[PDB]
Design a protein around this nucleic acid. Structure first.
Length: 70
DNA sequence: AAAAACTATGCATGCTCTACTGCTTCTGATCTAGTCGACC
């Protein structure tokens, strides 16, 4: 199921997507609301930040979380 | 006849209830914008 989440049927809809997941990450990590990391996570599509990948939300989240996790 | 002791009282303090009015803050209801899931 983890390898192919799209085929999951037993589990109900998560209800969280890129925007909601970014908001939850900002709230939990206690990052500043108007800080660079929060804007990058929320505006992951915008390439103005020129921080590695500009379209992949997962890559931006990994870059933001590299110094925050074990 | 003269001095001392007890009682009336009375005005002022601080406390207490009781209420009234104002400001600050918390809760709840409502409106509006954004988001997710399903399909096609």
């Amino acid at each position: 199921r983890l390898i192919l989440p799209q085929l999951e049927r037993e589990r109900m809809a998560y209800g969280i997507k890129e925007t909601m997941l970014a908001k939850l990450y900002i709230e939990l990590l206690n990052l500043p609301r108007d800080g660079k990391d929060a804007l990058k996570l929320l505006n992951y599509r915008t390439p103005t930040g020129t921080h590695g990948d500009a379209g992949d939300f997962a890559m931006i989240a990994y870059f933001v979380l590299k110094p925050r996790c074990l």
